[PDB]
Scaffold this active site. Structure first.
Site, PDB file in Angstrom:
ATOM      1  N   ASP A  35       0.829  -1.202   0.000  1.00 28.03           N
ATOM      2  CA  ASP A  35       0.000   0.000   0.000  1.00 28.03           C
ATOM      3  C   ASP A  35       0.866   1.257   0.000  1.00 28.03           C
ATOM      4  O   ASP A  35       1.338   1.683   1.045  1.00 28.03           O
ATOM      5  CB  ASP A  35      -0.893  -0.008   1.246  1.00 28.03           C
ATOM      6  N   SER A 199      -0.468  15.612 -12.057  1.00 27.45           N
ATOM      7  CA  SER A 199      -0.701  15.250 -13.442  1.00 27.45           C
ATOM      8  C   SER A 199      -0.932  16.517 -14.252  1.00 27.45           C
ATOM      9  O   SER A 199      -1.470  17.506 -13.756  1.00 27.45           O
ATOM     10  CB  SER A 199      -1.910  14.320 -13.529  1.00 27.45           C
TER      11      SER A 199
END
Length: 330
Positions: A35, A199
């Site tokens: 994770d 992004s």
């Protein structure tokens, strides 16, 4: 040193991925959910409330000659999805794919919430976010990666998740045969303890690319792709009959649909998520309403590039003094 381990989807939907991990002496192999959105290595154990164990493999520290109680240390974690676990702490030897760390904090669960109990395939979590998020008190502990880092050939790990197929976690090296083209690296902020990056935009299907900054986290422990409501609405508007259902808890679409791809930007590079990756199947057995793999982050408070996005790429988690993230097509 290096390590290399195969990671395997837990079910036919790629809801999560499990990776075998050796703990203790002799080794006890548990299948953990790696994770990159949390920083605790915790396991089902001989200390876990019996009614909360249903099929998991447990760690038994009393059977490990290298286990030592970390006296006074406790831990308690609550995840974004409302699940939780807590307990006490041992140190022991932990190996992943041939890479060994001695003195790793292994957090033994005394209690786990129902979603963990109900998932018989996940024996615990191995956190790979920054150690500043680790919940052990009163002495915060380091992640497996943080402990291994100095011994690694290069201070990196990579995630290469499969679509409906196994993939690989590598530690200490970049497998140049595992991706196509070049790796594009992008800046990371560690201010919130995550692999947080920005992004450069998105496209829906064959549509034009929209240049826009989207701050979010690279999170192998989250199944879906969670993005701003504007972006998600633009995606689902291209699927006839798709809608956001408050009763179901997100966007659903007719199972008869063919889904468009979704592209996200990494610098000047582009990662394309095929439409099929965005199909999470019937909302309930036999239903013709299917659950979408792109969902709104509104009210999560953060955008999450979860498995839906990451499995479309070869992803480098660069833990050098100034961390960065790399993405390549594959």
């Amino acid at each position: 040193s290096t390590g290399s381990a195969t990671t395997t989807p837990i079910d036919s939907l790629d809801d999560a991925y499990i990776t075998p991990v050796q703990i203790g002496t002799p080794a006890q192999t548990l299948n953990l959910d790696f994770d990159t959105g949390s920083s605790d290595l915790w396991v089902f154990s001989s200390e876990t409330t019996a009614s909360e164990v249903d099929g998991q493999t447990i760690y038994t520290p009393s059977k490990s000659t290298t286990a030592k109680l970390l006296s006074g240390a406790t831990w308690s974690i609550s995840y974004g999805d409302g699940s939780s676990s807590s307990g006490d702490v041992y140190t022991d030897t932990v190996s992943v794919g041939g890479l060994t760390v001695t003195g790793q904090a292994v957090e033994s669960a005394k209690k786990v919430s129902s979603s963990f109990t109900e998932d018989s395939t996940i024996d615990g979590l191995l956190g790979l976010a920054f150690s500043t998020l680790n919940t052990v008190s009163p002495t915060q502990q380091k992640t497996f990666f943080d402990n291994a880092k100095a011994s690694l050939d290069s201070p990196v790990f990579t995630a290469d998740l499969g679509y409906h197929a196994p993939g690989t976690y590598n530690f200490g090296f970049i497998d140049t045969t595992a991706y196509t083209g070049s790796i594009t690296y992008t800046a990371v902020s560690t201010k919130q303890g995550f692999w947080e990056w920005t992004s450069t935009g998105y496209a829906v299907g064959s549509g034009t690319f929209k240049s826009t900054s989207i701050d979010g986290i690279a999170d192998t422990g989250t199944t879906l792709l969670y993005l701003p409501a504007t972006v998600v609405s633009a995606y689902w508007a291209q699927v006839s009959g798709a809608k956001s259902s408050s009763s179901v808890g997100g966007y659903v679409f007719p199972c008869s649909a063919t889904l468009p791809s979704f592209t996200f930007g990494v610098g000047s590079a582009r990662i394309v998520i095929p439409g099929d990756y965005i199909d999470f199947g019937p909302i309930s057995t036999g239903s013709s309403s299917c659950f979408g793999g792109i969902q709104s982050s509104a009210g999560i408070g953060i955008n999450i590039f979860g498995d839906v996005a990451l499995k479309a790429a070869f992803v480098v988690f660069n833990g050098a003094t100034t961390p960065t993230l790399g993405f390549a097509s594959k």
